[PDB]
């Protein structure tokens, strides 16, 4: 309907904060803004947008937009140079597809190691020392590590550490034929993960909820998560620290860097109102603060505000891990990649398959 903006953003982000920015927008223009956080919104958007339905604005990490752009579901955005200059060129490149800007960049995200300082005055610098650390903590009724094992996003950093990668980036272009989830590096990483579970250091059923509850309750000494999680830890009054992910085989864990982006529905009858909202309301120091105060965005795309927050050691750790990882590709095949890697990790973790077998199939399924 014309005269109102409907926004879709993931449930782990600051949707209440975004609703604040929308409430302001409404007062100033009289246009009602509604924020929703449906589940699997990134799978639903392509389905409902393709039929003239769906939100006016969709929020998600940049990796999903190439797919949307290719299916002509996104309205091309065209900020004038004055606005483009307000944001970092790295974030704009993330939302550029086929040489066309397809969404607005918001913030840069990367996973970090989060630890309980009272339980671990000194967190491990390597993955290898985690088993011994766990045996010690189990002796006290605690566990060393717990993080979401259901989403490949979280395990990928370890898998990429010694060699894994999605698509070979050959001089400005990705080769959808050269996939690196099958190489020896990736196998080492995943094997190390499987063994942790085999040796009872971790449980294959652990999801985002299980892990977040255990950490925030001081049951486990460490977790792995993004900026959005800091907010709940703060309320839990757990004395935590945010730092570099532990190495593996003397090499840095390589998390996939994501840029939270906002795309405008091509079928939206409010493209102008949407751009007005994103450019002059959300991507301002006041807009981002509203959202950030709810759930941290990480390293925002707006130069002015990222500078105001750059001193936060948690952001520093975020950018440090981000600098060590790779920015996710945004091409259509990424979905296939993620789906493929998800199955591989879940199968190897539960034993349904062997590391080799699992990665062998993901390798095939990715480039499929």
């Amino acid at each position: 309907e014309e005269g109102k903006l409907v926004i879709w953003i993931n449930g782990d982000k600051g949707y209440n904060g975004l609703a604040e920015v929308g409430k302001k927008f409404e007062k100033d223009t009289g246009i009602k803004v509604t924020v929703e956080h449906p589940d699997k919104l990134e799978e639903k958007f392509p389905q409902v947008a393709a039929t003239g339905d769906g939100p006016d604005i969709i929020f998600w990490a940049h990796d999903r937009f190439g797919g949307y752009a290719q299916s002509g579901l996104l309205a091309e955005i065209t900020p004038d140079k004055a606005f483009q200059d307000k944001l970092y060129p790295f974030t704009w490149d993330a939302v550029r597809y086929n040489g066309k800007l397809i969404a607005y960049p918001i913030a840069v995200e990367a996973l970090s190691l989060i630890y309980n300082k009272d339980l671990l005055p000194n967190p491990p610098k390597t993955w290898e020392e985690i088993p011994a650390l766990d045996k010690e903590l189990k002796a006290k009724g605690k566990s060393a590590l717990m993080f979401n094992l259901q989403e490949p996003y979280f395990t990928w950093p370890l898998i990429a550490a010694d060699g894994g990668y999605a698509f070979k980036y050959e001089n400005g272009k990705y080769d959808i034929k050269d996939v690196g989830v099958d190489n020896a590096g990736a196998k080492a990483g995943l094997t190390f993960l499987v063994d942790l579970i085999k040796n009872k250091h971790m449980n294959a059923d652990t999801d985002y909820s299980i892990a977040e509850a255990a950490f925030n309750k001081g049951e486990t000494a460490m977790t792995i998560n993004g900026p959005w999680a800091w907010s709940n830890i703060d309320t839990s009054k757990v004395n935590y620290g945010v730092t570099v992910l532990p190495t593996f085989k003397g090499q840095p864990s390589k998390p996939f860097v994501g840029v939270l982006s906002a795309g405008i529905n091509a079928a939206s009858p409010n493209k102008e109102l949407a751009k007005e909202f994103l450019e002059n309301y959300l991507l301002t120091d006041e807009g981002l603060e509203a959202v950030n105060k709810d759930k941290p965005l990480g390293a925002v795309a707006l130069k002015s505000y990222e500078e105001e927050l750059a001193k936060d050691p948690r952001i520093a750790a975020t950018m440090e891990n981000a600098q060590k990882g790779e920015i996710m590709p945004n091409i259509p095949q990424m979905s296939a990649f993620w789906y493929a890697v998800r199955t591989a990790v879940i199968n190897a973790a539960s034993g349904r398959q062997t590391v080799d077998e699992a990665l062998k199939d993901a390798q095939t399924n990715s480039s499929s």
């Binding site: 039929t51 003239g52 339905d53 290719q70 299916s71 002509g72 579901l73 079928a267």
Partner: protein
Amino acid sequence: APVKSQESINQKLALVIKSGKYTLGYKSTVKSLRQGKSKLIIIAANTPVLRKSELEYYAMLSKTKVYYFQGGNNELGTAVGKLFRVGVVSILEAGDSDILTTLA
């Protein structure tokens, strides 16, 4: 996939109007659907008052493909302008147009 230019849709539509068979609007379209004569229906998602759900319901029961045009009334060609104006266009015969093999 709605991966086509408004300029392209308008050109394909103009060709059907020029050399094929088609209906315009709710009434003639569901009739073409109920009769199983429609080969495709195109819906201008953003047309003012549109019985979108009902049209989609009829396309489903008649097993007829539907293509959605996403543009607004602004900057429209002749054919697409009619489309946007009547909300729905049902293609009964493509004629010299390739609309059926490129949109359905």
